[PDB]
Amino acid sequence: WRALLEAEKTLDSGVYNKHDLLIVRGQGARVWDAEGNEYIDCVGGYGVANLGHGNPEVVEAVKRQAETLMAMPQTLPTPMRGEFYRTLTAILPPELNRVFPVNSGTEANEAALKFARAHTGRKKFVAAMRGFSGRTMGSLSVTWEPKYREPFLPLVEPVEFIPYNDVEALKRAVDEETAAVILEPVQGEGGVRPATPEFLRAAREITQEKGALLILDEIQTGMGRTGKRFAFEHFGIVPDILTLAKALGGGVPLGVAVMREEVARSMPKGGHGTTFGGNPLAMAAGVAAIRYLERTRLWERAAELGPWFMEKLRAIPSPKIREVRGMGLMVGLELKEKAAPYIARLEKEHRVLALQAGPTVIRFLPPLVIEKEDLERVVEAVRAVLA
Amino acid sequence: WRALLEAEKTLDSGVYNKHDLLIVRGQGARVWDAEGNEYIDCVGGYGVANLGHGNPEVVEAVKRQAETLMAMPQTLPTPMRGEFYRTLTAILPPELNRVFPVNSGTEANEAALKFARAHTGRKKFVAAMRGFSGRTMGSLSVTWEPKYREPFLPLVEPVEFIPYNDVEALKRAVDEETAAVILEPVQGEGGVRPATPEFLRAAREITQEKGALLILDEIQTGMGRTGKRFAFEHFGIVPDILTLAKALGGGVPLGVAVMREEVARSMPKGGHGTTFGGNPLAMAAGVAAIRYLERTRLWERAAELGPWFMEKLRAIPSPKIREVRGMGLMVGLELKEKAAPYIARLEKEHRVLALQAGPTVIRFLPPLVIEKEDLERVVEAVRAVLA
Ligand SMILES: Cc1[nH+]cc(COP(=O)(O)O)c(CN[C@@H](CCC(=O)O)C(=O)O)c1O
Ligand SMILES: Cc1[nH+]cc(COP(=O)(O)O)c(CN[C@@H](CCC(=O)O)C(=O)O)c1O
């Protein structure tokens, strides 16, 4: 197995920091390395494995559709596509009844941005500092982290950033020339920072007052992650365009930009498109993913386990912890120092896999099927590494 | 089945011209609609089904990996990724040994543009008129078609376009401020127009002389579509970055940008990324697709049937036919009048699905395993619809 690891390290572009281990299988919230070591996975492909590694229903839907049909364009209707369309819009506010399927989050946001420009006829985009929307140049233009943008300038203009949760800043920034505002209900990479009701209420109200669109990026908060089907169900606002991805396909690359009908209608024929977007394989996985989510009301586990996990985390007596925050099973532990060293030790010393969300924050995005025995061990592991 | 069709038509964003039918299954170069009618598929998901609908090896690879592991990020090595990396680089010239896996053709070019700027420190992109590179804003900036770019400007700048196959024009445009040239060995959407040896050689030489990077877009011409493994093999040149997608995963959403070592090396850690890019499921499918392509040397069927197929089309006694062109099984039939109605007749009266490549061109992108007897049927169908 060491030849595959070394081949991956060698042939990779090098843009990633690859860990010294090879993960070969996964079931539920557990994964195994090539040596047989079993880990608690709080990474879950960056919030993709919400339904759990090896989810039976999704795996089955994938196997069956793979035998039937995988390549069929948007110009040629295919049953699983219509089924995904009606299954996803049925668990959403009736205003969001138009779907543009894609293959990633960045493509979902790229779709939202384009649909927003064609509909308003405006150009400006307003986003929040510490926000992440994707790496493709369109989505990168509204992604804050200067490190990620500077090297590739100039990007798409004009874009304006405002502090997250700053009601007045958002109010001043949104004008008659703003095509749309794009925000995460809970900032992910930005450090697991929940939006305030006042902030999202202001975003909704002012975008309407100015004729601008509101794009809510729930690529990471979606599919039960925050304790509710979708984070927005926590605040009581309905955006003009909703973008989803990650867990939407239960593992299969899948994304979607759901929008109001008058928004979709403004897009000229052939104004946008995608080869893989809407393909039967992803569509089938999507139907399965959503059907599992709804039958099991999976967001509940995050709603019950989230607070429970965060409480135990808080109880950890270490002066290195500044704050424990999050919503449901989207948790962040902010330290008063670099988190990277502790993430490496959780993996090798405790077989616990975690993420970062800024250099001093440890982020947890475990599958929502994860049990309490596993969450408790993660806690103990964190406590042990911090001591 | 009608319920599912109306649901797709109604809930779709509406940016597509959806045909009046519902395709439920496929096998080889044939597909069936929900009524049981069988069609000869020359669309193939827009050149995705190169290996044929239902390819045993790919379908099987998908089933096995789906039960094993589907969600695992780039920071955590996984066997199928290392396998894909070496399997893909092994079928390419030595120089192309660094891989950045993605989820679509547009993401592949988006990565190519970003790596180019990072490596050269330059900003300018040079593309060809009638060229197509994708719908995300980055790739859209280098895509000609005004009706597609215009409504979304301003986009990524600066971008200069030159006439396809114009040697002197390309030379005058590529200078010490050019980050990269991006070209298709054979323009797809632009009407199936092959590059000439002089033009591509010119591109390779002038980019080297000026310190600019050469990006060859084989998202459409790749995987044995033009008669050889990759279209550049017919021209005797090695690009600096090769972008692929479409048939690369045998149906599963997959794309990639393969580049020379010094190019990848210039990219800052974390300078680019993607959630789904490089996931085990797409990697496993990618491995199976390549092994199949190599075992059968599938491009040979394209090289043999292509020329034969084109001669047959040119011999059709119809004054409406202007010219036939293409390479392997990437064929374009140019008519002296709108093609749309003949594509509708082909579908309804002969159950032959075909594409367009401009308003006056009928484009054919059938699985490479299509039977010679079926292409004859296609030629016959064309001769009848043009009567
Ligand atoms: C809110 C959000 N929006 C858009 C994206 C982009 O979508 P996609 O094209 O499918 O990556 C991501 C990835 N953020 C995760 C991964 C980023 C990375 O690759 O690093 C994460 O923050 O862990 C997001 O967290
Ligand atoms: C050369 C080429 N490059 C990049 C892309 C972008 O890849 P993707 O992001 O996966 O679509 C395509 C799709 N072009 C076909 C489909 C466009 C459409 O949606 O229609 C086409 O040639 O019509 C290409 O033909």
UniProtKB/Swiss-Prot annotation, chains A, B:
Subcellular location: Cytoplasm
Reaction equation(s) it catalyzes: [amino-group carrier protein]-C-terminal-gamma-(L-lysyl)-L-glutamate + 2-oxoglutarate = [amino-group carrier protein]-C-terminal-N-(1-carboxy-5-oxopentan-1-yl)-L-glutamine + L-glutamate
Gene3D superfamilies listed in its UniProt record: Aspartate Aminotransferase, domain 1, Type I PLP-dependent aspartate aminotransferase-like (Major domain)
Cofactor: pyridoxal 5'-phosphate
Annotated family: Belongs to the class-III pyridoxal-phosphate-dependent aminotransferase family. LysJ subfamily.
Assigned keywords, A-Z: Amino-acid biosynthesis, Aminotransferase, Cytoplasm, Lysine biosynthesis, Pyridoxal phosphate, Transferase
Gene responsible for this protein: lysJ
EC number(s) from the headed UniProt entry: 2.6.1.118
Pathway terms, separated by semicolons: Amino-acid biosynthesis; L-lysine biosynthesis via AAA pathway; L-lysine from L-alpha-aminoadipate (Thermus route): step 4/5
Binding sites annotated in the UniProt record for substrate: R135, T274
The UniProt record lists the keyword Cytoplasm: yes
Entry GO MF terms: identical protein binding; pyridoxal phosphate binding; transaminase activity
Mutant phenotype after disruption: Auxotroph for lysine.
Function: Catalyzes the transfer of the amino group of L-glutamate to [LysW]-aminoadipate 6-semialdehyde, generating [LysW]-gamma-L-lysine. In vitro, can use N(2)-acetyl-L-ornithine and N(2)-acetyl-L-lysine.
Chain positions with N6-(pyridoxal phosphate)lysine modification: K246
The species this protein was found in: Thermus thermophilus (strain ATCC BAA-163 / DSM 7039 / HB27)
Keyword Hydrolase: no
Residues where pyridoxal 5'-phosphate binds: G105, T106, F132, D217, E218, I219, Q220, T275
Superkingdom, natural source: Bacteria
Any one cellular-component term (Gene Ontology): cytoplasm
Record's protein name: [LysW]-aminoadipate semialdehyde transaminase
Cofactor note: Binds 1 pyridoxal phosphate per subunit.
Single Gene Ontology BP annotation: arginine metabolic process
Subunit text: Homodimer.
